[PDB]
Amino acid sequence: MKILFVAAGSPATVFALAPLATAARNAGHDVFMGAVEDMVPYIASAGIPAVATTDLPIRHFITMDREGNPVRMPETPEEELDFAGHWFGRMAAGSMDALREVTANWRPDLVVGGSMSFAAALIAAELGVPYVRQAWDTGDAWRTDPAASDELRPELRALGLDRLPDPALFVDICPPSLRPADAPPAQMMRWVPANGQRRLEPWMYTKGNRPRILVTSGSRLVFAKKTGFLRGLVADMAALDAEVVIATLDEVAEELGVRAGWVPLDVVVPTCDVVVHHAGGVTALTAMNAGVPQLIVPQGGNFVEAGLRISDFGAAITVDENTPEAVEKACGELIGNPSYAERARELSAEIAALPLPAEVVGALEGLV
Amino acid sequence: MKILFVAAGSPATVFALAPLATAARNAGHDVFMGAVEDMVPYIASAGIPAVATTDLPIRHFITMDREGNPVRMPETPEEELDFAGHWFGRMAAGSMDALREVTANWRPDLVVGGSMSFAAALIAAELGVPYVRQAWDTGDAWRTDPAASDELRPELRALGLDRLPDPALFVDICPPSLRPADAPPAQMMRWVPANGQRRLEPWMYTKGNRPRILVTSGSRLVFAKKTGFLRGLVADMAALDAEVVIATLDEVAEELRTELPGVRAGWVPLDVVVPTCDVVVHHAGGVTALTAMNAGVPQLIVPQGGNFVEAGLRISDFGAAITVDENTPEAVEKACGELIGNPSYAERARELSAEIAALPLPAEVVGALEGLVE
Numbered sequence A: 001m002k003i004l005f006v007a008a009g010s011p012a013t014v015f016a017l018a019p020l021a022t023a024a025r026n027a028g029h030d031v032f033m034g035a036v037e038d039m040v041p042y043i044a045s046a047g048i049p050a051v052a053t054t055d056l057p058i059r060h061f062i063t064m065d066r067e068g069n070p071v072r073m074p075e076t077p078e079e080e081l082d083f084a085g086h087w088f089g090r091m092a093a094g095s096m097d098a099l100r101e102v103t104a105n106w107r108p109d110l111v112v113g114g115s116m117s118f119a120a121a122l123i124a125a126e127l128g129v130p131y132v133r134q135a136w137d138t139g140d141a142w143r144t145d146p147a148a149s150d151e152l153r154p155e156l157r158a159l160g161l162d163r164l165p166d167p168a169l170f171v172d173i174c175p176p177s178l179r180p181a182d183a184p185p186a187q188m189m190r191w192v193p194a195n196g197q198r199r200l201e202p203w204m205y206t207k208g209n210r211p212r213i214l215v216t217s218g219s220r221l222v223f224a225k226k227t228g229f230l231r232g233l234v235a236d237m238a239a240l241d242a243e244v245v246i247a248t249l250d251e252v253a254e255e256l257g258v259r260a261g262w263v264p265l266d267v268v269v270p271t272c273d274v275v276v277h278h279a280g281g282v283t284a285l286t287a288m289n290a291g292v293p294q295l296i297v298p299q300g301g302n303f304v305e306a307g308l309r310i311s312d313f314g315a316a317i318t319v320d321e322n323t324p325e326a327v328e329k330a331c332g333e334l335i336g337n338p339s340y341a342e343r344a345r346e347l348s349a350e351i352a353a354l355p356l357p358a359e360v361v362g363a364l365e366g367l368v
Numbered sequence B: 001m002k003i004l005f006v007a008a009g010s011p012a013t014v015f016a017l018a019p020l021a022t023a024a025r026n027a028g029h030d031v032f033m034g035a036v037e038d039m040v041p042y043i044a045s046a047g048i049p050a051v052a053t054t055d056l057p058i059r060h061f062i063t064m065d066r067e068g069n070p071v072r073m074p075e076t077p078e079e080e081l082d083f084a085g086h087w088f089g090r091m092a093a094g095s096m097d098a099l100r101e102v103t104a105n106w107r108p109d110l111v112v113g114g115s116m117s118f119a120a121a122l123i124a125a126e127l128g129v130p131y132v133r134q135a136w137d138t139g140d141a142w143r144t145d146p147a148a149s150d151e152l153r154p155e156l157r158a159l160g161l162d163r164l165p166d167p168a169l170f171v172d173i174c175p176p177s178l179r180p181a182d183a184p185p186a187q188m189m190r191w192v193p194a195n196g197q198r199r200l201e202p203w204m205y206t207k208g209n210r211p212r213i214l215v216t217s218g219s220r221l222v223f224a225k226k227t228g229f230l231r232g233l234v235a236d237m238a239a240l241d242a243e244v245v246i247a248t249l250d251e252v253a254e255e256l257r258t259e260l261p262g263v264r265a266g267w268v269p270l271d272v273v274v275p276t277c278d279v280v281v282h283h284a285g286g287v288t289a290l291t292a293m294n295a296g297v298p299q300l301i302v303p304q305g306g307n308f309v310e311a312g313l314r315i316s317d318f319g320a321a322i323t324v325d326e327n328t329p330e331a332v333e334k335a336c337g338e339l340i341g342n343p344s345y346a347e348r349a350r351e352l353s354a355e356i357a358a359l360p361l362p363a364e365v366v367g368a369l370e371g372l373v374e
């Protein structure tokens, strides 16, 4: 069958859908994946036919409303959920014309979207084909839905809807120990990494004679360009008897004797003792899946609550970026206390026991 | 488990192994794929961790022997098999130092190689781990083995071997109707395309008001750079009531835009555009042949040497293709009209598509790889 995958505006959103898209292609299905123009090379470098959904970057949708007026940034975690629903809602609204042009010429039998790829819900409703919602992290996939429904009220009213339509199938990757009590029934799936690759050098897959700490701020150029966070973290680990690796975009690495640049996370994370990040859901999954403890230093966003569930489980520590010596103390505790790695290995075993993307293809086929 | 895939020196060799490598990664295995330095971006753009096996291109291995002496190019199809075994053998020999450095630090539990990725056979024997040979086209995977064994005699002697070791498992993609009578038993697999991708434009996935002819000379820059073949084919199709698309490397398309204006030339993901075509015209490329076969599209084979010529003749004898004895305007023009006009060719191509579709999925074949280390 013809399956249209809808990613968003960040490389992590392409990576989160690449296992199921490649599994469907491997089963003989005709698969296309859509994302913002800037993300098209990431889809192509995942080996999937790529279509552009809008020529605008995430920064356009984040900083301004539909009328082009400046949007104030969130000040609290409660504000973050509403703010995300709105900018993801705006990106979805800005993606409809290109998705209509593509699906008029190549009509999919099924549409698969990520957590906040709301244009997948809308185009599937317009086409009258089943809509599959795939969680792209261990956070609640529906966590920005009320604000997103409010943003997309004109598009939803045109379809005769009052809120975002419920998917025909919900595909979840959250391991049982991290799933909330109010989580809806789902087709579970084993998350597997599918991040951007590059020529491997021996240091990437071989551990050194010292503990290794990986530091990253994600794959979003608009947030990664704020090098202050990465320089701050590197400065806070100076006293530790540890090798520090900065995993960041190559163009950001240019501005930064510390190793900085794109290092395929799935390859390097099993050689690390700690993974330090900005509260990025897919980096969080890479660490968990490899059974590696992680330090979460939240830089806003909407994964903060889900990252606190990993911390409460004991496979991570959530600290404040602006509490002196907190990053240093937490790194020492994650390397030195074996309980963090034991809980991370427990989460790795839970992920490994979930249905394979190859088996989940059968659930997509059952819908049509 | 840790699985090392070994591609060769051409993008098509990376594409031929990418479905099984991604299926193994999708099953939770740790997968690395090796190829010549020039092919490393193709592995990475297939979403697979990439290691370089040698810094030398296929041109180095094709034109010079180990002592640096010039190698004369073959003339006959019998000569082609021996020429290929010797140059693939040289590429394999030149790949051993880097594969030893990689596998000393990342020890695989299993090694999977393409049809003529002979370094996969040697590195697996050295490590003492099972070796999986995966056919990368419908041609006989073992067709260059005697000359390859001769070339790799120093490396094989060091392992106490007289010839290339037999794989622990042979994975074949050749549909039953095209398999020779002397083909060894195999784990069959459904071939799926996994070629280099691009931003899609509507013309790539939408057919026009006229029949569409795709023309290509493959993904090897050393052979694609010979633009004469592509220019020649387009000129031979001028009288036909059909649109012509040239699928070639972008750096080769740069030369064609100043030489042949008004014709579309450049990298088109073949899996996307081939179902919109009436005919696929190629240089006798096995993976293009499979793309056409799988989409149920008739194909025109205009052999430019190589070792797929015999396997392409089997498709031609089955009736899902035509091979031309000479590259003349009259033969290319006639065979084209016959592939568009006579419905039997597409009927046969759809039969081969149904045979491929009935073979075990790459996801199921992962289980056969696991059974070898069990």
Ligand SMILES: Cc1cn([C@H]2C[C@H](O)[C@@H](COP(=O)(O)OP(=O)(O)O[C@@H]3C[C@@H](O)[C@H](O)[C@@H](C)C3)O2)c(=O)[nH]c1=O
Residues within 6 Å of the ligand: A010, A011, A012, A013, A015, A016, A136, A137, A195, A196, A216, A217, A218, A219, A220, A247, A248, A249, A261, A262, A263, A264, A265, A266, A277, A279, A280, A281, A282, A283, A284, A286, A301, A303
């Ligand atoms: C910089 C860098 C990144 N990556 C990959 C790893 C991971 O798959 C992705 C980074 O994503 P991450 O979860 O760190 O955050 P972000 O890129 O900001 O992605 C956003 C925010 C997440 O919280 C959310 O779960 C994503 C779906 C979108 O990119 C690499 O493999 N190597 C690198 O060097």
Ligand SMILES: Cc1cn([C@H]2C[C@H](O)[C@@H](COP(=O)(O)OP(=O)(O)O[C@@H]3C[C@@H](O)[C@H](O)[C@@H](C)C3)O2)c(=O)[nH]c1=O
Residues within 6 Å of the ligand: B010, B011, B012, B013, B015, B016, B136, B137, B195, B196, B216, B217, B218, B219, B220, B247, B248, B249, B266, B267, B268, B269, B270, B271, B282, B284, B285, B286, B287, B288, B289, B291, B306, B308
């Ligand atoms: C130029 C071009 C190529 N491709 C892909 C399609 C196909 O997967 C591959 C071309 O391989 P092909 O079978 O045409 O031949 P070649 O590139 O010369 O590959 C050699 C010779 C084959 O006979 C043998 O089967 C290959 C493994 C190696 O590259 C595209 O998707 N788009 C393009 O524009």
Ligand SMILES: [Mg+2]
Residues within 6 Å of the ligand: B150, B151
């Ligand atoms: Mg000899």
